[PDB]
Structure formats: C-alpha cells, structure tokens
Write a protein that binds this ligand. Structure first.
Ligand SMILES: Nc1ncnc2c1ncn2[C@@H]1O[C@H](COP(=O)(O)OP(=O)(O)NP(=O)(O)O)[C@@H](O)[C@H]1O
Ligand SMILES: Nc1ncnc2c1ncn2[C@@H]1O[C@H](COP(=O)(O)OP(=O)(O)NP(=O)(O)O)[C@@H](O)[C@H]1O
Ligand SMILES: N[C@H](Cc1cccc(Br)c1)C(=O)O
Ligand SMILES: N[C@H](Cc1cccc(Br)c1)C(=O)O
Ligand SMILES: [Mg+2]
Ligand SMILES: [Mg+2]
Ligand SMILES: [Mg+2]
Ligand SMILES: [Mg+2]
Lengths: 262, 262
C-alpha cells in the first residue's frame, strides 16, 4: 500500500536534508519510520558526544566575532521596548508592520526590529566615541505572521549600523559580501536614501540602507550612515538546506534541525 | 554650597565603582560633573578601541563554554511560551509568581523561568541520549517586579539540569562551586526533594533543586535530577560591584555599567 499523506508528513519530520532516502519506494511506513528514527537518534548522540552547541547560539557567536573583529561595538538592548518607538519609526496603519506587533501591557511591545535601539545608541555614543561609530546587535525579534515556510513569529535578527565617515553604498556592499562569504552563504544584492535587499533566490536574507533619510531627525541623528538587518534563522535555513524555517528556530520540536519527537 | 540631591543623583549616575572620587567634598557640581563625564567618555573609548564586547553577551559566552565543556547540551528554546506551562508548573494564585507574568495575547506569555522548556527537553532527549542527560539554557526571562536594586523586569537566566545517574546533592554543590569559583564570585550555599539557595550576602544568586519531586509527573519525568537557575545580571552586579542591577541590564542607559547619557 502507498503511504498515507499523514504517514508521509510523519516521515518528512524525521527526514534530514542530507538523507539519501526516498519515501516514494515500496517499503512499508513502519520500516521507513524505524530507519529514520534510528538515524536521528544517532545524529543527536553524535552532537551530545562531541560539540554540544546549538546552531542558533553558535551562529550568534560566530557573527559576534566577525563584527567585533571588524571594529563594531557589541550592543545588548531591551527586547521589550516602548510602544512609542514603533510610531516613531514611521510605522503607521498604512504599513504591514503596524498589524504585526505583539503588544505587551498598555505601553510596551516586543520589538519587531532593532532599528529604534540602534538609533538611540548611535545618538548617545556620538557624544563619546571617535568617528565613525560602528555598532551591532543580535537578538530576538517578534512579528505576527501568516503560516509560511520562511517566517517565524519569534526570530533572531542581526542589525549593524555605521555612522559618520565612510558611509558609502560601496562600503556597505563590501561588509555584506565579506560577511556572507565568511559564512559560506550564496547571495545576490538587488537595488536600484538608497535601499538594497540581499537575496538568496526568492528568499530575502537582509534589507540594507544608506542614510541620511528624513526619519533620522526624529531620532536625533544628523550624520550619514549605512546598515543592514539579517535574520539568523534564514541564514541557517539556507546553510543547512532546511525545507522549512521551523527547523532553525528556537524550538521544542527541533534541535539543530533534528526532530526531538522520537 | 552643598550639592542638591538632584545633583548628587546625576553624579551617582556617572560614578563607577572603581572611582576614587568622593562627592562629599567642597568642589562645585559643574566641576565634579565635568570630571566624571571625561572619565566615562574615556572608559567608552577604551572599550571601543580594544575588546568591544558587551558584558552580558560575554558572560553568556563564558558560561556557555563552561557547561559545554562539562558535557551539557546547549539548548535555545522559545521565550514566548504557552500560558498553560505556568499552571502546569504549579504556579497558582497562592504564589507570588502568578501575579508576575507578562501575558501576551490570550494564550501566551513571556517565560518567567526556564524550567518548563528544560523539563520538555529532558523528556524528549531521554528517548535518544545516553544516561545521564545534561542540558543547559541561557536567555531572557520576564517578571513584573516592584522597584528594587536587585530586580529587573527583563533579565537573563542560566538554567541547567541533569537527569538520571549521578543526581546527588553533592554533585549539584560541586557543579555550583566549580562554576562560581571559575567566574570569581563569592558565595555561600544555604539549605537544610531537597532545595538550596546560593547566596552572596543577602542577594540570591541561584535557587537549586534535587529531584524527584511530585511535579515531575505532570511533565512526563520519572527519573532523579539535579538543577539550578542563576540570574546573569546578578552575577555581573556582584562581579563588578554595581550598586544597582540596572547597571548590568539590557539597557539603553548603561553600556558595561557606564552611563550612556554623557
Ligand atoms: N517573520 C520573520 N521570520 C524570520 N526572519 C525574519 C522575519 N521577518 C524578518 N526577518 C528577517 O529580518 C530581516 C530584516 O527585516 P525586514 O527587512 O523588516 O523583513 P521583511 O521586509 O518583512 N522580509 P519578508 O517578510 O520576508 O518580506 C529580513 O531580511 C529577514 O531576514
Ligand atoms: N526580577 C529578577 N531580576 C533579576 N534576576 C532574577 C529576577 N528574578 C529571578 N532572578 C534570578 O533567577 C534566579 C532563579 O529564579 P527564582 O529562584 O525563581 O527567583 P526568586 O526566588 O524570585 N529570587 P528573589 O526574587 O530575589 O527572592 C534567582 O536566584 C535570581 O538570580
Ligand atoms: N532593524 C533592522 C536592522 C538595521 C539596522 C540599521 C540599519 C538598517 Br537598513 C537595518 C532591520 O529591520 O533591517
Ligand atoms: N527555571 C530556572 C532553572 C532551573 C532548571 C532546572 C532545575 C532548577 Br532547581 C532550576 C529556575 O527558576 O531556577
Ligand atoms: Mg515581513
Ligand atoms: Mg525587507
Ligand atoms: Mg522573585
Ligand atoms: Mg529563589
């Protein structure tokens, strides 16, 4: 008998991208399931015996070293942010993002992006640090999303920003290119303040920008800048050839892309 | 003229624990403020020129290396968790913690602790990994709190748990002792399933436990265990002799304990 769709769904959960197994063959569900269960248990045993590091944590640490080594200051700013920061960012009711905010209490929200906190740090650090000011942050961000293989409601974003001298599109593309070649992730930069997107096929890895833009004034910024935001789970999805970004997420259902339901 | 209380408050923001400056002296506010501003700008310049790492990020990475090296698997689990996990943990209306939860939407909350996710990982990994199972997680936790120099509403917690063989109070105290001696943090273990607290004077650094306890059954756990939870900002507060834990927090107001309002 052919596998049911439910049985195929179950096998897909246990299938990893490097497997050379095809579900289409005549072998019965129970034997395919037992084979994949054995493989995934061995995969977890090998992680536990050797490296023991979580993909998302390890990627954050690798990205951190890259940017610290390039002269960027590591920022850790609040995840629970004032709701007023959303409106200040120009996110009004005519934008998609206005409907995607997780509100907390009556005056706070889970941050959907890093830009407000990075703007505040640029303004404050400009009183103390020499030109140019280079900063970055990695951490959780939150958006309400429709179901989709490329979106999480709880994800992790890298944001970096440079302000002052050297804030050219060329320098921005050079940072992006060195960064993704360091990680081993294929990309194309697409673009015509200037804006550009970093694409892996149809998947957006990053949106980047060149300042100054009119919004800067509301944040007390009056210098040129360049910066970009990257989703870490999307980087992991591409690097490991996951079919669904849920394999890369903070999760109780997957560990380093391996099903925990064994 | 003596300094006003408001002027003293302003100087205290700029005062760092290693400063050898006393505000009590006759010198005028403006000169004391200008001296402290110069010192704090130089402190930020030195960080930017040399290490560029954030105290909270760096501590997370150091703790991660300690536990990975000791055989613990690094977990990254959801911060936004089902509200049902709170009740399942035995947190009912007769507990303080029930009134401290940040609710999100109608069925989710910001996690106030790591225990639910660690229980779930122990249960699932017991199907794949050899005895004993050793896991840990570091990440944001959230609690509504009264104003106080030892509490944050947004903080970072280390949780570790071992399940199976070797789950003795002696082994638990040995992990705690090696860990805090590695970090260079003075402590006392106080205690009479068994429970114990790790104290720095009157400040609680950790609460730890030895299983099994009746609650385990609700989470599908039926093996002995040991574990503990530590607040990272409290570790930083003790290590750096901060007077208020706000100096150690995810923050827009302090960077590595240095005021950003210069
Ligand atoms: N829901 C999400 N899940 C995972 N990653 C995300 C999510 N939203 C944004 N990101 C990442 O964060 C980066 C910067 O955010 P932003 O440019 O605002 O996203 P976006 O324009 O909404 N992308 P998309 O929703 O795919 O059209 C993106 O390039 C993504 O890599
Ligand atoms: N609001 C907070 N801010 C910073 N750290 C915290 C906070 N709550 C708990 N922690 C840390 O997390 C550890 C384990 O949490 P738990 O034992 O539930 O805290 P607790 O018993 O409420 N401590 P306390 O509130 O100081 O009496 C504690 O030992 C603290 O180091
Ligand atoms: N907030 C993030 C990060 C960021 C930071 C600075 C400049 C730029 Br462009 C983007 C984003 O959504 O892209
Ligand atoms: N949830 C955390 C971490 C934790 C994990 C396992 C056992 C123990 Br005890 C404590 C706490 O509040 O202590
Ligand atoms: Mg989007
Ligand atoms: Mg975009
Ligand atoms: Mg408490
Ligand atoms: Mg306690």
């Amino acid at each position: 008998p052919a596998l049911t769709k439910s049985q195929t769904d179950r096998l897909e959960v246990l299938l990893n991208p490097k497997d050379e197994i095809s579900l289409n063959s005549g072998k019965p569900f129970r034997e395919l399931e037992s084979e994949l269960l054995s493989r995934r248990k061995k995969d977890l045993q090998q992680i536990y015996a050797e490296e023991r590091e979580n993909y998302l944590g390890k990627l954050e640490r690798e990205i951190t070293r890259f940017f610290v080594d390039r002269g960027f200051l590591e920022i850790k700013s609040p995840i629970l942010i004032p709701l007023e920061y959303i409106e200040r960012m120009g996110i009004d009711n005519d934008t998609e993002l206005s409907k995607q905010i997780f509100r907390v209490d009556k005056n706070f929200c889970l941050r959907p992006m890093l830009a407000p906190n990075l703007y505040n740090y640029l303004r404050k650090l400009d009183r103390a640090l020499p030109d140019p000011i280079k900063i970055f942050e990695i951490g959780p961000c939150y958006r309400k999303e429709s179901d989709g293989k490329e979106h999480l409601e709880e994800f992790t974003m890298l944001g970096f920003q440079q302000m002052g001298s050297g804030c050219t599109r060329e320098n921005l593309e050079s940072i992006i290119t060195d960064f993704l070649n360091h990680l081993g992730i294929d990309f194309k930069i697409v673009g015509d303040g200037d804006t550009l997107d970093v694409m892996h096929g149809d998947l957006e890895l990053s949106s980047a920008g060149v300042g100054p833009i009119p919004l800067d004034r509301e944040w007390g910024i009056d210098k040129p800048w360049i910066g970009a935001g990257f989703g870490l789970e999307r980087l992991l999805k591409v690097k490991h050839d996951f079919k669904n970004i849920k394999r890369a997420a903070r999760s109780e259902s997957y560990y380093n892309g391996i099903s925990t339901n064994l």
